[PDB]
């Protein structure tokens, strides 16, 4: 009644793009949680920096309690590791989003490679009136799989560079973090899910 | 080696993106020439079909006009092969643009592989204030090499529909031709050249 080996691929794509929509919801909800956390990191960086600049100076009024610099710094560093532990939780969310898309798309590609020689090179390239061609369907999932892995690299490397000291770098964290998004293609996954939004509801 | 083993890669990129800028100008100047060529193919298809339908006609005005039905058909096919030959010239332009970028990017990536173990994983990922990171510079050239090669395949296969001779199929050539463009990443080569516009003038 219909082409059988194409239904297995069409159902694989009908089940894959709704997963990408869920993963993008957690991916975006995690990057939003990193906006105020890195802002408070830059704040604690300024406090630690100003305190370190005036840790060798001797203001006469604060000389009454010379054990003040040690207590103030410890309290600042405690609030710093609290922000770092919560930021690590958000990296775990971005890691989960990356692992889900990088594995489900590979499973959809296994279904495609099962019928790669049987569907025919002509049936894949042919598009519909509202559904893009099956070739564009798979290549767009590869571009989404690249976008999440290429961004997760920048998110993880930048959030591991803060541990390497550098009091000035952790003060400019939101400046380079917001650069990661603007330098990449932020409006890419939302456009692929838009062109295939007609293919999902049959 | 140089005082900085990465300078050989930055010099390769400073010479590669201006070349991609030239190739995109020829790539687009050829696609614009294909809009009226496919329109004239659909136009001659409508004329050829209507003229062939009227082989049984007996027009009183057709009196004293010898070989008019015969010559018109030959004359339509001559003007058709002229449009086909011009479309073949435009495919040669799109293929040359593809072979240029696919060769310059491969040469830039060979220069990178010479110093991959000597430049350091930190120098590549590190961006500047106005120039993106050298890693994104190479990865964007990988996306451009994909855009030209993945489009050239669709451009040639869709323009192979002329082999069917179907007057209805070649009448919808400009309808499906504009679909290839809008479905691709139209604002990609011009957008990558925008982020690197600060790196070139250094």
């Amino acid at each position: 009644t219909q082409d059988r080996p194409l239904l297995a691929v069409q159902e694989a794509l009908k089940k894959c793009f709704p997963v990408v929509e869920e993963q993008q919801g957690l991916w975006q909800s995690a990057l939003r949680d990193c906006q105020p956390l890195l802002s408070s990191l830059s704040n604690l960086a300024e406090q630690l920096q100003a305190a370190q600049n005036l840790r060798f100076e001797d203001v006469p009024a604060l000389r009454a309690f010379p054990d003040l610099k040690e207590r103030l710094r410890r309290k600042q560093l405690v609030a710093g590791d609290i922000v770092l532990d919560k930021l690590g939780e958000r990296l775990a969310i971005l890691l989960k989003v990356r692992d889900m898309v990088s594995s489900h798309v590979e499973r959809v590609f296994q279904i495609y490679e099962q019928h790669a020689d049987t569907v025919g090179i002509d049936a894949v390239l042919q598009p519909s009136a509202v559904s893009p061609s099956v070739a564009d369907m798979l290549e767009w999932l590869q571009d989404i799989e690249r976008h999440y892995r290429k961004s997760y690299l920048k998110r993880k490397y930048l959030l591991s560079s803060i541990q390497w000291g550098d009091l000035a770098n952790i003060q400019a964290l939101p400046k380079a973090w917001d650069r990661i998004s603007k330098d990449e293609h932020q409006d890419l996954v939302q456009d692929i899910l838009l062109n295939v939004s007609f293919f999902l509801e049959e | 080696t140089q005082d900085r083993p990465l300078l050989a890669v930055q010099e390769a990129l400073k010479k590669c993106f201006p070349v991609v800028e030239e190739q995109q100008g020829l790539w687009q100047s050829a696609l614009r020439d294909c809009q009226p060529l496919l329109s004239s193919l659909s136009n001659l298809a409508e004329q050829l079909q209507a003229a062939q339908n009227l082989r049984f006609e007996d027009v009183p005005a057709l009196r004293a006009f010898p070989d008019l039905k015969e010559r018109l058909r030959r004359k339509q096919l001559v003007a058709g092969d002229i449009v086909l030959d011009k479309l073949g010239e435009r495919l040669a332009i799109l293929l040359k643009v593809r072979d240029m970028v696919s060769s310059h990017v491969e040469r830039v990536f060979q220069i990178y592989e010479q110093h991959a173990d000597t430049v350091g994983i930190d120098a590549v990922l590190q961006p500047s204030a106005v120039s993106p990171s050298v890693a994104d510079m190479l990865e964007w050239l990988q996306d451009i090499e994909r855009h030209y090669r993945k489009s050239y395949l669709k451009r040639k296969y869709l323009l192979s529909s002329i082999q069917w001779g179907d007057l209805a199929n070649i009448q919808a050539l400009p309808k499906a031709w504009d679909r290839i463009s809008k479905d691709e990443h139209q604002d990609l080569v011009q957008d990558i050249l925008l982020n690197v516009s600060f790196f070139l003038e250094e």
Binding site: - | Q47, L54, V78, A79
Partner: protein
């Protein structure tokens, strides 16, 4: 030498008149295409009158038919102006073939009856300039007479496949063979116009 310069002069005018013919034919094809769109728009309006068959489309039938008539006669006068333009070219073309026609009539006579033929340029005898001037003339004489018939019948017809074929004959002109551009070069290279 004066007959030789007039052969080169006619050879130049033959090229200019061909360009004037194809240029006026382009403006004529725009007028004819507008005539076709006027016939199609009237048929489209006839279906709209049958859809909105209220007692207001039978009145708009008179309004549209008058705008159709005024624009049809305007396009018929515009197309007839293109016919007259191509006719002035054809008159000059008959004048180029008749002017050449006199040259060899007295050229073979000046030296008795077949004694020796002096080449007007390097190779082409004066007779060969006739075989080009006559074929080029007869091609556009047929083409002009056809374009007249297409202009008259295009406004009268209503058949879509006939309208397309009417516009088809006008765009690419049939009676002018494709080899006409080569025969012109074979004469322009001879007379000295085309660069050696």
């Amino acid at each position: 030498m004066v007959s030789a310069r007039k052969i080169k002069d006619n050879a130049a005018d033959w090229h200019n008149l061909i360009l004037k013919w194809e240029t006026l034919n382009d403006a004529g094809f725009t007028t004819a295409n507008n005539i076709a769109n006027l016939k199609i728009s009237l048929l489209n309006k006839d279906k709209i009158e049958l859809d909105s068959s209220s007692p207001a489309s039978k009145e708009n039938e008179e309004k549209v038919c008058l705008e159709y008539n005024e624009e049809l006669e305007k396009l018929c006068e515009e197309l007839q102006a293109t016919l007259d333009g191509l006719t002035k070219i054809q008159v000059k073309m008959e004048k180029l073939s008749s002017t050449t026609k006199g040259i060899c009539e007295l050229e073979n006579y000046h030296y008795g009856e077949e004694s020796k033929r002096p080449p007007l340029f390097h190779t082409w005898p004066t007779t060969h300039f006739y075989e080009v001037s006559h074929k080029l003339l007869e091609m556009y004489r047929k083409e002009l007479l056809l374009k007249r018939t297409v202009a008259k019948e295009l406004a009268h017809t209503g058949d879509p496949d006939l309208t397309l074929s009417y516009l088809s004959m006008w765009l690419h002109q049939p009676y002018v063979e494709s080899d006409s551009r080569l025969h012109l070069e074979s004469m322009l290279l001879e007379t000295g116009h085309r660069a050696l």
